Each structure stands twice: as structure tokens, then as C-alpha cells.
Design a protein around this ligand. Sequence first.
Ligand SMILES: [C]O[C]1[C]([O])[C]([C]OP([O])(=O)OP([O])(=O)OP([O])(=O)O[C][C]2O[C](N3=[C]N([C])C4=C3N=C([N])[N]C4=O)[C]([O])[C]2[O])O[C]1N1[C]=NC2=C1N=[C]N=C2[N]
Ligand SMILES: C[n+]1cn([C@@H]2O[C@H](COP(=O)(O)OP(=O)(O)OP(=O)(O)O)[C@@H](O)[C@H]2O)c2nc(N)[nH]c(=O)c21
Ligand SMILES: C[S@@+](CC[C@H](N)C(=O)[O-])C[C@H]1O[C@@H](n2cnc3c(N)ncnc32)[C@H](O)[C@@H]1O
Ligand SMILES: [Cl-]
Ligand SMILES: [Cl-]
Ligand SMILES: [Zn+2]
Ligand SMILES: [Zn+2]
Lengths: 114, 299
Amino acid sequence: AFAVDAAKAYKDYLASGGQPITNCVKMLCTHTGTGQAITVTPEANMDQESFGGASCCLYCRCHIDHPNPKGFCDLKGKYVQIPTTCANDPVGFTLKNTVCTVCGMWKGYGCSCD
Amino acid sequence: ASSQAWQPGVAMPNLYKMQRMLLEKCDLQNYGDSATLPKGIMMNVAKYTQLCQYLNTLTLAVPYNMRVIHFGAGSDKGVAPGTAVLRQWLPTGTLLVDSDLNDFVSDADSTLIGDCATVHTANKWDLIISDMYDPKTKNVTKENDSKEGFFTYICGFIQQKLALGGSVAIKITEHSWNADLYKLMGHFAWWTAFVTNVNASSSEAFLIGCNYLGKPREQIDGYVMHANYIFWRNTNPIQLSSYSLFDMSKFPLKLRGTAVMSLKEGQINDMILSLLSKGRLIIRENNRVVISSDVLVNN
Ligand SMILES: [C]O[C]1[C]([O])[C]([C]OP([O])(=O)OP([O])(=O)OP([O])(=O)O[C][C]2O[C](N3=[C]N([C])C4=C3N=C([N])[N]C4=O)[C]([O])[C]2[O])O[C]1N1[C]=NC2=C1N=[C]N=C2[N]
Ligand SMILES: C[n+]1cn([C@@H]2O[C@H](COP(=O)(O)OP(=O)(O)OP(=O)(O)O)[C@@H](O)[C@H]2O)c2nc(N)[nH]c(=O)c21
Ligand SMILES: C[S@@+](CC[C@H](N)C(=O)[O-])C[C@H]1O[C@@H](n2cnc3c(N)ncnc32)[C@H](O)[C@@H]1O
Ligand SMILES: [Cl-]
Ligand SMILES: [Cl-]
Ligand SMILES: [Zn+2]
Ligand SMILES: [Zn+2]
């Protein structure tokens, strides 16, 4: 069946000079959190910014089916921590980067399990 | 800047509630002015953050598996900033349902799209937040009379789906208001009109009903109380402030583990009313939560 690949389509739209998805809901927090990638409550640290999950999910924002089997979303209802230097495009960050299964931090931005 | 600038907002003083003023036009001294918000923070994140900061000082009932419904949660941006704040503020395990006339993505457990009039629910709620506002209210062509529309629904929803001991926060403005809604505030242990310091240059306010008693504790004339609210806003300029936003250490709502009992109208004496009045008790069924949206069908 023809699968509409939107994950790469966005990487192509950006790489060709395109406006990143805005209106991502940034939250007010102490910035003294664990610094983990996805959390039930804002856990941004002094180097991060917390955002509402649903607002940072490409699938939710574009109203399209979710890759995860059953249509389960990993961001809706959670909060995603984004490095301040990459907070201008939270959606693009969640796609490109991956979360460490051990510590629960972003790999290359907090995960030091090696 | 008076000590009010350090509060999340300002509540209508008791002496203004006891007046009997006639409805005058609202003319704010700073109408139009905008507050300085923390870098990259949306107005509605700041607004809901101050509302929740104020709700923390009230005797809200907070049981395990608390039930919160949020009407008017959508925006022209397609996201729900206010719902994101409620998710942050409410204890984990709290059921949060939001709804709006237009489609939007939310962090709520469940979202209903459509006119609030089409929303049905078998169970009762512990907290109701309404940020509904009809854009047609901006067309003032006659006298400022009591508005109906979604307010009619909200009054019926509170009387039938609000748990005893439950609380409400309904958004109003100079022209977006209802007389029956002010009368219902008299069915709570306590009520007030709350103005956020970040939107102090707006006639906007949240009518807060604290601890629903199910019966009139006070006799309130809606037309008179709205005139009193306008008189208060016209005579008390509030200085725009976002200072309360820079301290989020005590933000989360404390889980009081309030008791939930399924009593009948015959087992409600004065002893029980005093517990409801202190957010020490919630009265409602504790069955599964079922919501539905009516779908009108056309050929
Ligand atoms: C998201 O949250 C929004 C806001 O936070 C909240 C309220 O916002 P507001 O603009 O502050 O409203 P207000 O002017 O303070 O009161 P009003 O009832 O709208 O008066 C209507 C009319 O009366 C006149 N007036 C009112 N006042 C108080 C005056 C004045 N004139 C003066 N010289 N001095 C004044 O003091 C003016 O001309 C107005 O147009 O409602 C939401 N909301 C607004 N618009 C929409 C919307 N939501 C969805 N779609 C919308 N289109
Ligand atoms: C904020 N609040 C006020 N009241 C009632 O309103 C009265 C006046 O309360 P107030 O808010 O008008 O002023 P005050 O600074 O005295 O508030 P306090 O810190 O509660 O004393 C109180 O004595 C209570 O009877 C309240 N009653 C209930 N049940 N719940 C509340 O959250 C609440
Ligand atoms: C001020 S906006 C809500 C903003 C939202 N609380 C936020 O966090 O950004 C008011 C909302 O009320 C909704 N609304 C107005 N009348 C309604 C009705 N009868 N039923 C449902 N929603 C309604 C509008 O669709 C609009 O999105
Ligand atoms: Cl106050
Ligand atoms: Cl906003
Ligand atoms: Zn999603
Ligand atoms: Zn790791």
C-alpha cells in the first residue's frame, strides 16, 4: 500500500529553505528538572525549554496516521524537553534525534552512557 | 507598583459585590496595553498559569482520579495552550477532557470537537474551566443585555453535571456575560471575579464558583452583579504584571486526596454542607467516564 512518508518530506521541506512548524506551546518551568527527553511534567534544565507534546508531534499537527502500531502517540499528554539552541524548531528536533532507553535523555544532548 | 503586581491577579473586593450600581459602559484606563511576557511565552500560557496560581489559594476539592472538563480549549493556531497548562498543573492520574467548536490538537485524555450544546456526559465533574467566547460579541449594535448561546448550556451543565464540592472558572467580558451564571455563583460556598495581571487591560475576568452546594446560599441579581463588576473595573485600574510567572516552584496543585462519597439528597445535612464548603468532600458517583458528541445528519 502507498504510505505517505511525512517524516522525510519535512526534512526535505526544511533542507530546501522552509519555515519550521511554529505555535509549539512552550511551558513556564523552574528549569531545575531531570533533563529527560519525554516526561509526564515539564523537566527542562538550565540548558532546555519544555513544550507540550501534542504541539510538537508532526502527526498530530498535520492530522495524519501515527507510525506506532494502534495509532498511539508518544508526545500527546507528555512534555518534550528541547535544547535552547534548537528550540526554534521543536518538531524537526524530535524527528531527527532519538531517546536513550537507559537514562531517558536525548542521544547527543545529555545521554552519557558511554 | 502596588503589592498586587506580585500576585497572579486581582479578585473583586467584597465591598463592590454588596453595591447596587446600574450597568455603565466599561472604559479601562489602560485598554489596549500589552504586558511584557517571558521570552517565547504565549499569552494564553501566561493567562492560564496565573489562573491556576490563583486557584491554588482556594479551598478546591482535589480527589484521586479527579475529573476536569475544559470548554473553549481550541485556538486559531490549532493548538490548546490552556490545556497544556492544566495538564502541567493537575496531579498525574487526573482525567482531563477538553472541547471546542473548531478542530485542534490537545494534550487532554480526550477531545470533543463541536458546539458545546452537542456534548453529553453520564458522569459528573469536579472542576469545569470555560474559556468560550463568541467572536460575534465584538458586534455591539444595541444595549449590553445578558447573552445566551453557550452560557445557556454552561448553566445547565453546572446544575446537572457538577459534583457537590466541585468548582468552576468561567471566562466573561464586558459584553460576553450571562445573568443566570452570576445567580449560580450564589449556589457555591464562595465566589469572585478574577482578573489575571497579564490581561489586566481587558474587561475579561473568570467567574470562580468555589465548592458547589447544589442550592442557593446567597440571592444574587445577575444584572446588578455585572454592573458592580464593570463599576469595579472602571474605578480600579490594574497595573499589567507578569511577575508571578517567574516563580513556578509552588505551581503544581497539591493532591488533597479529598473523599468522594455517593450520597442521596436525603443524606445531605448541615454537617455535610460544612465539609463541602472547605473542599474536604466531593459528592458524586465514581463510575466509568463516558462522553459523547451529537452528530446532526443532512441528506
Ligand atoms: C482569547 O481570549 C480573548 C480575550 O482575552 C478575551 C477578551 O478580549 P478583549 O478584546 O479584551 O475583550 P474586551 O474588549 O475587553 O471586552 P468585550 O466584551 O469583547 O467588548 C467588545 C467591544 O467593546 C469595546 N470596549 C470594551 N472595553 C472593555 C473597552 C472598549 N472600548 C474602549 N475604548 N475602552 C474599553 O475599556 C471594544 O471596542 C470591544 O471590541 O476574549 C477572547 N477573545 C476576544 N476576541 C476573540 C476572542 N476569542 C475568540 N475570538 C475572538 N474574536
Ligand atoms: C478565598 N476564600 C474566601 N472564602 C470566604 O470568604 C471570606 C473572606 O475571604 P476573602 O478572600 O474575601 O479575603 P481574606 O483575605 O479574608 O481571605 P482568607 O485568607 O480566606 O481569610 C473567608 O473568611 C471565607 O469565608 C472562601 N471560602 C471557601 N470555601 N473557599 C475559599 O477558597 C475561600
Ligand atoms: C479565547 S478562545 C479559546 C482559547 C483557548 N482557551 C487557548 O488556550 O488558547 C475561545 C474559544 O471558544 C470557542 N467557542 C465559542 N463558542 C463556542 C461554542 N458555542 N461551543 C464551543 N466552543 C465555542 C471558539 O471556537 C474559540 O476557540
Ligand atoms: Cl486579590
Ligand atoms: Cl495565546
Ligand atoms: Zn501525535
Ligand atoms: Zn543514556
